[PDB]
């Protein structure tokens, strides 16, 4: 029997089977319904498009995003996203597969129950479990104590974890993530003179970001190299055939993580967030958090991020302090990977929430078996 | 059944966990045959009173006398683990959750049994024995929370007033609280539960800063070496002596009253609940000051028999702590498997 | 300002102070004049235990105000 692992994380959902080292399905967390009724005619009681097919038809559809900040907000839409992942992306009967699911930090109590009611009542799984995204990411690096920085599409989180437990008094949420960066890249490339302003143009910039942006080790130094050399300018072939060139924009976009002001945001950068998070913990565990900063997600996926963070936290931490940033190359799907390891561990078989338990105790059973 | 064997594999397992886990396994497998009704009621009473030695023995003298209806494979591990069980005052986490839950129950109870008439009467006794620098309590007590805020203000009488009383103790002189100033730390955990400890999600409290207190392991005969089953919050309470000065005045002025035992118990009981909930102290950190014979002499002469907050059903709390200990311990088991898997792929 | 601090004996420490000064600052001035350890100190005004972080201004402690000092006994 195979267990399913679904990371409903921010904008992109990662699903697949436990044991595998990669998800089989990744797709946007997007639901659209017809804008006008004339398009439902003769379409067999279908009413909805979910995921990729909803992005292709955004012209004929009104799109809704249920988990833009990692917290589910529309449960009617989230059921359709889950139907789509079980029946269409995975091509599986969820009643045959125990399902490990994933939740943001500081997820409100009501939401864990609702998730559990739907997973059991609507899809009729035999077992289920809920883990915190950042904790699984720690597990995928073989740790149970550290501080994870989880950053995907719409939300960034610094999560101190001690012995498998996310410390609720030090969790910090940053409302600056991948999609805030793709928009800045557009702005600054439009300021050079190449125009990116339509929804189809955003998607182009999202590719140039993922393929050509990196994190400078010293912002000021790299700017100098750019203005005094061409070594770093790179070229990109556009869909029309046009070749645009990318200069200092390649590193000025991910700089917004350490310098959020570039976007009109007065909050602090992902390095000071890490410090601040670590300072809301007992000094008696900080040594362990410093030595185990784990980077996680699609926004952590820029060349040179780990070297940079090491240098920034080294400048905020005490002098005598072993600082280690861990940022695997598979770091984009590190949550999902933690899920697959956990769900395929022998001892976790005893740790599922069973259909029997759900019928006996109701959706609140989630609070007693999933910390 | 397999789960419990995996939980008994925990290195951190304490006397509390064993009692909780073992009774959990005895209650599932045996079911609710009423013959055993009493064993279960009795174990829970022994647990509350921290008589772990009697309960582990009774538990083991029940697993052998019913092995036919039990797994003898599991009884084996229970008996091997038992002689090695300790309790760690700095890490008695399952009990820290139990007492925190019990305190909320004790309050719910006295809220359903109290005309807060005793507390309105105590105000006169407080004003009499209060220091010149304490505020007179003038308002009337209508809520139980106002009754809490009143009794928890008797701490202004501390370090003066209660000194003739504290000085007659032989127990308090073995308090183990370190003078070291460690400041405060953030926490979202209720009661005497520790800040970095794992918790149920419907058992959090809004984040506030809480006191970091350290044990002085050099105190010869220290309370925490003497009562390792008590969780260390702040060692012994000397504000308990302060309640005593006020209580002595009250008993003196209401001796003729026929319902005085009921009333003094309501105060002792709200004080005990409040101290755990507020995180100030653990239960035995307060009860083990009050039970000292010199202070109990004050109650015996007034013919007041304290119940010390003992209720009739600690059942809900006992059960929620079983869920907590299974959770903690398969968690630990699971963490041991993962680590091993990564050490074989490293 | 000139505040007054009163020991359980009744004795009166007179101090020179500013509304700027914190409670931590005040206890230090007591250690300088009387030698009483800051950590041994518990200052009281308006019936309220006085916290170190706040300022004499945050506590309506003005000129000629009288404070009560209690010293802690512990092991
Ligand atoms: N004097 C006090 N006043 C208020 N709250 C206190 C006090 N002492 C302890 N606490 C509470 O104790 C709770 C948890 O801390 P606690 O778990 O007692 O420390 P600890 O880490 O176990 N110390 P140790 O026994 O040395 O490991 C917090 O919620 C605090 O509010």
């Amino acid at each position: 029997i195979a267990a399913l692992v679904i990371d409903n994380g921010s904008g992109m959902c990662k699903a697949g089977f436990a044991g595998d080292d990669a998800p089989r399905a990744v797709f946007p967390s997007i639901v659209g319904r017809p804008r006008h009724q004339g398009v439902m005619v003769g379409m067999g009681q279908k009413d909805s498009y979910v995921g990729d097919e909803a992005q292709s038809k955004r012209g004929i559809l009104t799109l809704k995003y249920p988990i833009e900040h990692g917290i589910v907000t529309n449960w009617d839409d989230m059921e359709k996203i889950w139907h789509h992942t079980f029946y269409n992306e995975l091509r599986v009967a969820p009643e045959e597969h125990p399902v490990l699911l994933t939740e943001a930090p500081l997820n409100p109590k009501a939401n864990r129950e609702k998730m559990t009611q739907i997973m059991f009542e609507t899809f009729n799984t035999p077992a289920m479990y809920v883990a915190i995204q950042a904790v699984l990411s720690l597990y995928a690096s073989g740790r149970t104590t550290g501080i994870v920085m989880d950053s995907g599409d719409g939300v960034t989180h610094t999560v101190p974890i001690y012995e498998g437990y996310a410390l609720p008094h030090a969790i910090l949420r940053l409302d600056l993530a991948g999609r805030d960066l793709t928009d800045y890249l557009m702005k600054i490339l439009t300021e050079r003179g190449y125009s990116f302003t339509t929804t189809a143009e955003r998607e182009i910039v999202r590719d140039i970001k993922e393929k050509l942006c990196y994190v400078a080790l010293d912002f000021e130094q790299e700017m100098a190299t750019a203005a005094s050399s061409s070594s770093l300018e790179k070229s990109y072939e556009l869909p029309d055939g046009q070749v645009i060139t990318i200069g200092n924009e390649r590193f000025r976009c991910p700089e917004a993580l350490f310098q959020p002001s570039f976007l009109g945001m007065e909050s602090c950068g992902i390095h000071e967030t890490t410090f601040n998070s670590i300072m809301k913990c007992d000094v008696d565990i900080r040594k362990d958090l410093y030595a185990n900063t784990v980077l996680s997600g699609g926004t952590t996926m820029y060349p040179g991020i780990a070297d940079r963070m090491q240098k920034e936290i080294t400048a905020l931490a005490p002098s005598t302090m072993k600082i280690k940033i861990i940022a695997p190359p598979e770091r984009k799907y590190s949550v999902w990977i933690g899920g697959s390891i956990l769900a395929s561990l022998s001892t976790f078989q005893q740790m599922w929430i069973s259909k029997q338990e759900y019928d006996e105790s109701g959706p609140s059973i989630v609070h007693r078996k999933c910390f | 059944e397999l789960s419990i064997s995996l939980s008994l594999d925990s290195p951190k397992l304490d006397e509390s966990d064993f009692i909780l886990l073992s009774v959990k396994y005895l209650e599932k497998s045996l079911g609710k045959k009423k013959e055993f009704s009493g064993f279960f009621e009795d174990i829970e009473k022994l647990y509350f009173k921290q008589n772990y030695k009697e309960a582990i023995e009774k538990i083991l003298d029940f697993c052998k006398k019913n092995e036919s209806l039990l797994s003898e494979q599991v009884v084996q591990r229970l008996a091997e683990v038992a002689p090695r069980l300790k309790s760690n005052p700095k890490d008695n986490e399952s009990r820290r959750l139990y007492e925190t839950l019990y305190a909320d129950h004790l309050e719910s109870v006295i809220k359903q049994e109290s005309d807060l008439s005793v507390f309105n009467e105590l105000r006169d006794s407080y004003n009499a024995v209060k220091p010149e620098y304490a505020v007179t309590h003038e308002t009337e007590i209508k809520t139980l929370d106002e009754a809490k805020q009143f009794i928890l203000s008797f701490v202004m009488l501390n370090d003066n007033v209660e000194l003739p009383l504290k000085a007659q103790s032989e127990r308090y002189p073995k308090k183990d609280r370190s003078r070291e100033e460690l400041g405060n730390t953030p926490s979202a955990n209720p009661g005497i539960m520790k800040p970095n400890s794992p918790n149920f999600t419907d058992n959090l409290v809004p984040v506030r800063d809480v006191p970091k207190i350290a044990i002085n392991e050099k105190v010869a005969g220290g309370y925490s070496k003497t009562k390792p089953t008590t969780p260390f919050v702040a060692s012994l309470s000397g504000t308990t002596y302060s309640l005593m000065v006020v209580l002595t005045d009250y008993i003196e002025k209401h001796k003729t009253d026929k319902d005085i035992e009921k009333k003094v118990n309501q105060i002792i009981n709200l004080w005990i609940s409040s101290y755990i909930k507020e995180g100030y102290h653990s239960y035995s950190e307060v009860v083990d000051v009050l039970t000292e014979p010199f202070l109990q002499s004050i109650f015996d002469k007034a013919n007041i028999k304290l119940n010390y907050g003992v209720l009739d059903d600690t059942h809900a709390e006992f059960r929620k702590a079983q869920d907590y200990v299974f959770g903690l311990t398969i968690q630990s088991a699971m963490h041991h498997e993962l680590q091993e898997r990564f050490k074989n792929k490293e | 300002m000139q505040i007054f601090v009163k020991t359980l004996t009744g004795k009166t420490i007179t101090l020179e102070v500013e509304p700027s000064d914190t409670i931590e600052n005040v206890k230090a001035k007591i250690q300088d004049k009387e030698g009483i350890p800051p950590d041994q100190q518990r200052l009281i005004f308006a019936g309220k235990q006085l916290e170190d972080g706040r300022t004499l201004s945050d506590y309506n402690i003005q000129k000629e105000s009288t404070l009560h000092l209690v010293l802690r006994l512990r092991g």
Side-chain angles (χ1 to χ4, degrees):
Chain A
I1 306 250
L4 293 191
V5 178
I6 156 152
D7 176 16
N8 321 277
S10 314
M12 260 164 150
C13 160
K14 309 95 194 175
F17 314 88
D20 301 349
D21 285 337
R24 301 258 186 93
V26 178
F27 61 89
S29 154
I30 305 180
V31 178
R33 297 158 174 90
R35 281 173 75 169
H36 317 289
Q37 290 183 346
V39 203
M40 270 178 288
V41 57
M43 286 306 184
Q45 305 160 228
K46 82 86 180 65
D47 166 61
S48 54
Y49 285 112
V50 163
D52 263 316
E53 198 159 37
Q55 255 295 132
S56 315
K57 314 188 165 160
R58 42 193 169 86
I60 81 183
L61 306 177
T62 157
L63 313 174
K64 292 220 281 178
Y65 310 92
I67 192 155
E68 249 182 336
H69 299 294
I71 290 129
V72 171
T73 42
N74 194 14
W75 296 103
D76 284 327
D77 298 348
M78 184 63 43
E79 283 179 36
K80 300 178 189 310
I81 280 169
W82 274 329
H83 199 274
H84 180 67
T85 82
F86 288 128
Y87 293 110
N88 301 348
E89 293 295 346
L90 260 42
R91 305 181 65 80
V92 303
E95 39 188 353
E96 295 158 5
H97 299 293
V99 179
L100 180 22
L101 279 147
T102 249
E103 66 166 343
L106 308 166
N107 201 26
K109 317 154 37 192
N111 285 7
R112 324 185 70 239
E113 297 168 16
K114 194 51 171 167
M115 161 172 273
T116 311
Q117 185 183 33
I118 293 174
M119 212 52 45
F120 274 122
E121 290 181 4
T122 291
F123 304 104
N124 189 30
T125 60
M128 75 143 298
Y129 193 85
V130 197
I132 297 200
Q133 275 143 214
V135 172
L136 302 168
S137 188
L138 196 66
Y139 287 170
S141 82
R143 292 153 178 83
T144 69
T145 283
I147 180 182
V148 169
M149 198 205 48
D150 202 22
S151 188
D153 322 86
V155 81
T156 300
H157 288 277
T158 30
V159 179
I161 303 136
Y162 184 68
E163 312 182 328
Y165 184 70
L167 309 170
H169 43 92
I171 297 171
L172 266 172
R173 164 173 169 197
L174 192 45
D175 277 285
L176 186 161
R179 291 156 11 213
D180 307 86
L181 250 49
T182 256
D183 284 339
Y184 182 64
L185 193 50
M186 269 164 59
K187 189 229 204 177
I188 65 181
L189 280 176
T190 313
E191 267 153 15
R192 179 124 326 221
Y194 324 105
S195 206
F196 298 93
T197 181
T198 83
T199 290
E201 265 155 4
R202 178 170 279 108
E203 275 309 298
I204 299 175
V205 146
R206 214 211 70 171
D207 213 46
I208 320 177
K209 205 193 48 179
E210 276 159 33
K211 278 165 178 189
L212 305 168
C213 300
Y214 66 103
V215 172
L217 183 52
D218 186 58
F219 190 62
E220 205 158 300
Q221 179 78 4
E222 210 88 2
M223 287 291 308
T225 296
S228 313
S229 158
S230 196
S231 57
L232 62 90
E233 300 167 23
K234 287 253 171 333
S235 287
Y236 187 84
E237 289 68 41
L238 239 64
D240 29 35
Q242 303 197 251
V243 179
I244 65 164
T245 351
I246 321 299
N248 60 15
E249 288 80 20
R250 308 176 48 207
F251 64 88
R252 273 167 68 220
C253 160
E255 187 62 37
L257 294 168
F258 299 94
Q259 300 197 244
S261 67
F262 281 9
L263 243 74
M265 187 168 183
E266 208 192 338
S267 86
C268 77
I270 60 178
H271 56 310
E272 320 169 284
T273 283
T274 291
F275 184 71
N276 298 343
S277 190
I278 299 169
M279 289 302 286
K280 297 181 281 163
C281 304
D282 186 8
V283 75
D284 292 326
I285 69 160
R286 287 178 208 163
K287 225 158 274 198
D288 295 322
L289 305 180
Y290 279 125
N292 296 276
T293 313
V294 180
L295 289 187
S296 179
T299 312
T300 59
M301 208 69 128
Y302 299 114
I305 199 173
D307 288 337
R308 174 76 176 264
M309 192 79 75
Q310 161 89 30
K311 148 172 175 267
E312 296 292 359
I313 292 174
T314 287
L316 307 157
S319 328
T320 36
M321 188 65 79
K322 305 92 190 59
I323 298 161
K324 184 162 181 189
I325 285 76
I326 300 92
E330 53 256 15
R331 89 191 159 264
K332 196 189 176 358
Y333 298 137
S334 270
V335 182
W336 192 96
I337 294 179
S340 157
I341 297 153
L342 179 79
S344 67
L345 288 172
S346 168
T347 170
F348 188 83
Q349 294 329 305
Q350 292 322 306
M351 290 165 81
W352 290 106
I353 283 175
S354 314
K355 187 166 165 300
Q356 287 216 334
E357 288 171 327
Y358 177 79
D359 288 317
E360 192 160 335
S361 147
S364 62
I365 182 58
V366 61
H367 301 292
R368 282 151 49 198
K369 298 197 70 153
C370 297
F371 294 17
Chain B
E1 182 261 359
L2 169 58
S3 57
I4 208 199
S5 341
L6 287 167
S7 286
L8 290 169
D9 267 328
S10 173
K12 279 191 175 169
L13 201 86
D14 61 42
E15 312 187 294
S16 186
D17 313 317
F18 181 87
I19 299 181
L20 282 172
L21 265 172
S22 73
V23 152
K24 175 184 194 292
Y25 164 81
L26 288 193
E27 179 190 16
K28 202 67 186 175
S29 57
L30 293 189
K32 282 163 178 39
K33 314 192 85 158
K34 290 283 103 51
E35 42 256 37
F36 312 127
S37 173
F39 172 84
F40 287 132
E41 197 195 8
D42 194 33
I43 285 287
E44 298 189 32
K45 265 130 64 192
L46 291 180
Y47 180 80
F48 183 77
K49 292 193 178 186
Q50 275 159 104
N51 294 324
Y52 298 169
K53 248 274 268 61
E54 196 171 337
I56 299 172
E57 166 186 335
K58 282 201 50 211
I59 296 182
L60 293 175
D61 283 329
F62 179 102
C63 291
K64 309 274 176 200
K65 294 168 181 63
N66 290 126
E67 266 153 325
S68 331
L69 285 178
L70 296 175
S71 153
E72 57 210 75
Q73 197 277 119
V74 160
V75 179
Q76 177 73 29
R77 308 236 27 219
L78 289 172
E80 288 163 348
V81 156
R84 183 60 182 96
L85 283 179
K86 279 209 155 187
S87 21
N88 186 214
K90 293 184 174 192
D91 265 78
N92 275 350
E93 300 181 8
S94 47
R95 210 195 151 78
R96 290 174 184 260
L97 178 124
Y98 172 82
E99 300 191 8
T100 294
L101 295 170
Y102 147 79
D104 269 280
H105 188 207
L106 183 65
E107 241 173 55
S108 108
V109 174
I110 61 212
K111 195 177 170 55
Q112 291 192 234
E113 288 175 6
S114 197
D115 20 290
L116 311 160
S117 140
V118 50
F119 302 114
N120 272 294
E121 292 170 354
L122 256 188
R123 301 191 286 112
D124 217 6
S125 301
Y126 163 74
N127 301 327
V129 309
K130 73 173 190 54
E132 157 210 0
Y133 48 82
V135 164
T136 318
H137 194 289
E138 305 272 57
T139 81
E140 192 238 353
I141 303 168
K142 317 170 74 189
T143 309
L144 187 80
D145 292 62
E146 274 176 334
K148 282 182 36 148
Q149 270 305 110
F150 165 61
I151 63 158
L152 258 50
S153 83
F154 289 174
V155 73
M156 218 80 33
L157 282 61
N158 272 46
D159 301 314
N160 178 19
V161 180
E162 28 91 68
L163 291 191
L165 215 41
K166 156 166 111 178
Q168 320 177 35
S169 176
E170 203 250 343
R171 283 190 195 174
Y172 205 75
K174 314 264 226 355
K175 194 180 164 176
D176 52 283
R177 169 173 173 168
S178 180
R179 288 185 181 186
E180 208 182 344
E181 293 298 324
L182 306 179
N184 279 39
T185 19
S187 183
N189 272 336
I192 59 133
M193 291 185 66
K194 304 161 59 185
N196 278 319
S197 292
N199 201 18
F200 305 122
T201 328
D202 53 8
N203 200 39
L204 275 36
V205 304
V207 180
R208 24 82 186 242
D209 284 42
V210 302
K212 200 141 73 69
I213 312 163
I215 313 180
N216 172 26
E217 288 160 16
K218 297 168 321 212
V219 176
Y223 180 85
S224 68
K225 303 158 167 175
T226 281
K227 269 271 264 234
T229 57
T230 309
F232 179 95
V233 187
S235 206
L236 301 182
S237 184
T239 313
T240 306
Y241 300 117
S242 322
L243 171 68
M244 285 310 295
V245 173
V246 46
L247 274 184
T248 300
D249 189 79
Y250 182 79
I251 300 177
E252 298 310 310
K253 65 188 33 175
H254 284 79
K255 237 138 48 191
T256 299
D257 238 325
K258 311 277 188 58
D259 56 320
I260 197 181
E261 219 186 40
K262 186 177 197 255
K263 299 157 99 186
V264 174
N265 269 301
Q266 246 146 51
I267 322 167
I268 303 287
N269 289 344
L270 186 82
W271 176 275
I272 289 173
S273 68
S274 292
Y275 265 57
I276 306 177
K277 261 187 59 167
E278 231 64 24
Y280 300 151
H281 286 276
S282 71
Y283 173 91
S284 279
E285 282 177 357
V286 150
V287 177
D288 280 357
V289 164
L290 269 162
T291 46
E292 202 168 346
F294 90 101
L295 278 191
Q296 185 63 30
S297 188
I298 299 181
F299 298 117
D300 292 352
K301 304 183 153 46
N303 214 33
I304 292 164
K305 169 75 172 202
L306 291 186
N307 63 45
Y308 295 109
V310 170
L311 303 157
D312 278 321
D313 58 326
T314 62
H315 203 343
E317 312 90 312
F318 192 88
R319 268 181 320 217
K320 251 175 269 132
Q322 289 176 328
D323 292 337
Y324 187 65
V325 73
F326 159 82
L328 264 38
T329 62
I330 36 87
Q331 178 85 326
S332 163
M334 185 279 286
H335 290 169
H336 183 254
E337 218 216 307
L338 167 112
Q339 272 155 6
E340 276 265 73
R341 179 239 175 253
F342 268 91
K343 269 153 26 190
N344 66 49
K345 267 217 6 141
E346 192 62 20
Chain C
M1 325 203 283
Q2 174 158 122
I3 66 170
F4 306 90
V5 169
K6 198 143 152 294
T7 73
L8 274 45
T9 280
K11 274 154 199 147
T12 306
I13 311 161
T14 299
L15 253 45
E16 316 287 346
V17 82
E18 306 287 346
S20 174
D21 294 337
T22 185
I23 276 65
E24 284 134 345
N25 238 322
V26 185
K27 304 170 158 193
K29 292 186 246 286
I30 298 177
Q31 190 197 15
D32 287 343
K33 199 152 180 156
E34 283 279 324
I36 299 152
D39 294 339
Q40 193 187 1
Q41 296 183 44
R42 277 211 221 264
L43 276 164
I44 298 135
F45 187 80
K48 192 39 189 190
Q49 180 79 29
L50 291 193
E51 295 182 68
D52 300 73
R54 264 81 164 198
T55 188
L56 270 46
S57 274
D58 184 87
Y59 280 132
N60 309 343
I61 296 170
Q62 276 106 198
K63 184 188 55 68
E64 313 258 269
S65 285
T66 321
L67 271 84
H68 283 85
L69 173 67
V70 327
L71 273 43
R72 307 163 54 190
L73 311 104
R74 43 190 191 146

